Amino acid sequence: ATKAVCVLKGDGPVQGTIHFEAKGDTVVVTGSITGLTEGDHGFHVHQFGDNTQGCTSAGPHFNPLSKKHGGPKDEERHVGDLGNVTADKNGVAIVDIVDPLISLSGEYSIIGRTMVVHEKPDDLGRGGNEESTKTGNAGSRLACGVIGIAK
Amino acid sequence: ATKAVCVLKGDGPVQGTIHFEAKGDTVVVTGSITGLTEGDHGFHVHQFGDNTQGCTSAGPHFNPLSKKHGGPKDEERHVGDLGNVTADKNGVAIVDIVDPLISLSGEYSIIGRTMVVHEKPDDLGRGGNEESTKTGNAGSRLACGVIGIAK
Numbered sequence A, B: 001a002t003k004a005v006c007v008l009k010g011d012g013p014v015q016g017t018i019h020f021e022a023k024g025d026t027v028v029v030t031g032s033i034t035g036l037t038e039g040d041h042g043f044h045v046h047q048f049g050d051n052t053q054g055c056t057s058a059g060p061h062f063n064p065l066s067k068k069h070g071g072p073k074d075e076e077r078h079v080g081d082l083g084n085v086t087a088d089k090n091g092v093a094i095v096d097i098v099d100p101l102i103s104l105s106g107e108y109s110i111i112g113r114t115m116v117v118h119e120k121p122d123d124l125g126r127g128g129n130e131e132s133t134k135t136g137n138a139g140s141r142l143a144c145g146v147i148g149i150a151k
């Protein structure tokens, strides 16, 4: 199972297509998100691929190792913690990420789970309040999609 | 996972929430679909969880064992062949299928793949032609969604 895709949709204008590819021992994340406000936006893999109640039903960040929230370069982070994507003034964010914790098969597989792009910047677990340790104070979910197997 | 869920969405009025629960070597499929025309509608699991082009990008019916299209009860069927769901006059179809072929884990898990509800009834590979043993002449794809892991 080597390629996956995720189409992000929400109640507003934010949309995007994210691609995942197993390369070597890692996973390459690419694609783009449009309709975003300029600046940073939290970008995470949530535990469930449940869109029955919008992006809400996706639950907390994918966290099989029971850790606290952090940035993608931290030792202490959720498997789903891919940090921030950055939208330019035109509202476009180009995604290009390589991540050591997610996978497309087995225990760390994100197939069947939800990709979410947030309203605000992820403070990488350094905000100082309890919320930072769970979600990075990234706020509401602007758009999401279930990660599916791609050809 | 022992539980999965799928939210069907299309370009028209059809929409639904489908539930999947593993039970023994079976998967119990339940839920409902609304906005359908009265009568039967093909209900299949397509290969890819790719929604980059509505339900078209989902690809063919999930068929890992390379067999011809049939109905759920047939030995010669595609794994994704779940048959027909029936809409009443109000166009609501209550889904209730117990299938021994689809699985929520292993080599031919349907998690990360696409659930598709069709325009026409599925003839179950008994329509008399060639389109009958590939799609069962179910027609266009009205609504679809990627099957995600549920809580």
Ligand SMILES: [Cu+2]
Pocket: A042, A043, A044, A045, A061, A116, A118, A135, A138
């Ligand atoms: Cu998040």
Ligand SMILES: [Cu+2]
Pocket: B042, B043, B044, B061, B116, B118, B135, B138
């Ligand atoms: Cu079909």
Ligand SMILES: [Zn+2]
Pocket: A044, A061, A068, A069, A070, A077, A078, A080, A081, A134, A135
């Ligand atoms: Zn997190």
Ligand SMILES: [Zn+2]
Pocket: B044, B061, B068, B069, B070, B077, B078, B080, B081, B134, B135
């Ligand atoms: Zn089929």
